[PDB]
Amino acid sequence: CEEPPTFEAMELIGKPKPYYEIGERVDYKCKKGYFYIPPLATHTICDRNHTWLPVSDDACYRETCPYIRDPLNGQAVPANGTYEFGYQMHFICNEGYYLIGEEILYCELKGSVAIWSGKPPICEKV
């Protein structure tokens, strides 16, 4: 096999070789800001078809901004589904009930932690 994949959350351990013999195993690590969360794989092997076995960065977790209790009568559903930084929180209200706050709270880099965008919505009545 050639050089193992590159990921946005994982960094290969040891320096890249040009060629890897079949049955050779490479191991990765979470990049400076990440945290690994069991169980998922973070390594790979060079199979008999001289390709690497599938593997994902999707286990190395980037910090997270706190938790948001579903505003009574609307669920606090994430799109870009995750409470990690760099994404958003939206307050879709119930077919009818509209908002006293704002539809989307974006979670992102603040200092070292990551906090969402401002303060969350109230789901009132009509």
Ligand X SMILES: *[C@@H]1O[C@H](CO)[C@@H](O[C@@H]2O[C@H](CO)[C@@H](O)[C@H](O[C@@H]3O[C@H](CO)[C@@H](O)[C@H](O[C@H]4O[C@H](CO)[C@@H](O)[C@H](O)[C@@H]4O)[C@@H]3O)[C@H]2NC(C)=O)[C@H](O)[C@H]1NC(C)=O
Ligand Y SMILES: *[C@@H]1O[C@H](CO)[C@@H](O[C@@H]2O[C@H](CO)[C@@H](O)[C@H](O[C@@H]3O[C@H](CO[C@H]4O[C@H](CO)[C@@H](O)[C@H](O[C@H]5O[C@H](CO)[C@@H](O)[C@H](O)[C@@H]5O[C@H]5O[C@H](CO)[C@@H](O)[C@H](O)[C@@H]5O)[C@@H]4O)[C@@H](O)[C@H](O[C@H]4O[C@H](CO)[C@@H](O)[C@H](O)[C@@H]4O[C@H]4O[C@H](CO)[C@@H](O)[C@H](O)[C@@H]4O)[C@@H]3O)[C@H]2NC(C)=O)[C@H](O)[C@H]1NC(C)=O
Give the one residue of 42, 74, 84, 116 binding Cl ion; rule: CB under 5 A.
42
Give the one residue of 2, 27, 51, 79 binding ligand Y; rule: CB under 6 A.
51
Give the one residue of 13, 40, 53, 79 binding ligand X; rule: CB under 6 A.
79
- Distances in whole angstroms, Cα of residue 87 to Cα of each of 14, 33, 50, 54, 126: 31, 16, 37, 26, 31
Using alpha carbons, select from 27, 39, 123, 34 the residue that is nearest to residue 85. 34
- Distances in whole angstroms, Cα of residue 21 to Cα of each of 16, 42, 111: 13, 19, 44
* Nearest approach, Cβ of residue 57 and ligand Y (Å): 18
80 counts as binding ligand X under rule CB under 6 A:
yes
49 counts as binding ligand Y under rule CB under 6 A:
yes
45 or 99, CB closer to ligand X?
99
Sign of CA dihedral 57, 41, 15, 17: negative
Binding residues for Cl ion (CB under 5 A): 42
Binding residues for ligand Y (CB under 6 A): 49, 51
